[PDB]
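Progress note, project year one: complex with zinc ion.
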Amino acid sequence: RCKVNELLEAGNAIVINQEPSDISSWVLIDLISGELLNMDVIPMVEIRTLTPPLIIYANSQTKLNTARKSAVKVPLGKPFSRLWVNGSGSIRPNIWKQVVTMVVNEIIFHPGITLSRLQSRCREVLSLHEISEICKWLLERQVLITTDFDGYWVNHNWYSIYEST
Amino acid sequence: RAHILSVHLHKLTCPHCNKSFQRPYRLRNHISKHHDPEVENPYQCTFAGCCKEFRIWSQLQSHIKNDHPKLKCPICSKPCVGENGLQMHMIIHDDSLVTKNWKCHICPDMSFSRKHDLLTHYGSIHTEEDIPLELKYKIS
Amino acid sequence: DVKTASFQDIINKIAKLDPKTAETMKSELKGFVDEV
Ligand SMILES: [Zn+2]
Ligand SMILES: [Zn+2]
Ligand SMILES: [Zn+2]
Ligand SMILES: [Zn+2]
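Model obtained:
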């Protein structure tokens, strides 16, 4: 997302001629779905004429990068009290990155999912209180929006949780 | 704007002792000590996508100054944060990946096909002074 | 393969069907990138 944002804001155009990987699929459909990207096609001249290389570019001076991150603190407490808090009373960064990813993964395909329904799908891992903690943090980071009647719905740029890999 | 933030929206006040602070930064530090939870690491990295946490404010000051120094692009002077920020932005100038077009900084008409050929216009209608840095910078 | 092409060659191919989109692109864009 950062590479694409910098290129498009710089007035560059991205050219696709082969299948983007499963990860580049998320970030491309997200930008396309937001109406921020214009698309044009490089024509040709067999089956291949129906699948020409595609060009993508930013529509205008409009911004693609989201606003700077605020200090949304991880929910913590007495030692061992949460799956992500160890015996020295410290955040297990691995487990926190895993549980936040897991909860967003189930809320993506189920727009509107309620806390009760969500606990049923995660019962072998998290208690209801632990999901109330994860959902509150994700709302504060704007990854989720509350639907009416207390449901959760994934916002644009939802994959932008943490830097890694 | 100042009246609202100084007479109604009391955002600079402590939620507990009801002192107040001249910037949100010092209010954050105050809450992290004088009203702190039982947590071992009261300080957490304030930046984009960084998940690390610290025992003493000096270690956080060190971590921000080490891993999130605010830089300016060597070529275009636009600001960025940390080593990843610079390395991500350096792609934009890269002539190997970004097979960019070639134009004069002033003359509207130009339409070159190679980098060496573009230097002919800057070498004749201009000179080696006031050529743009991205064209000049053979830095790799 | 368009991977080998120049910026002028790519805009020329677009102009073969419609010069309006090609002229608009040349007047606005700074450069292509392969999605790699
Ligand atoms: Zn206080
Ligand atoms: Zn950090
Ligand atoms: Zn630059
Ligand atoms: Zn000129």
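Chain A touches chain B at residues 2-3, 6-7, 10, 12, 68-69, 71, 73-74, 76-78, 88-91, 93, 96-97, 160-163 (CB under 8 Å).
Residues B 104, 106-107, 110, 121, 125 surround zinc ion (ligand 4) (CB under 6 Å).
No further modelling is planned for this target in the current period.
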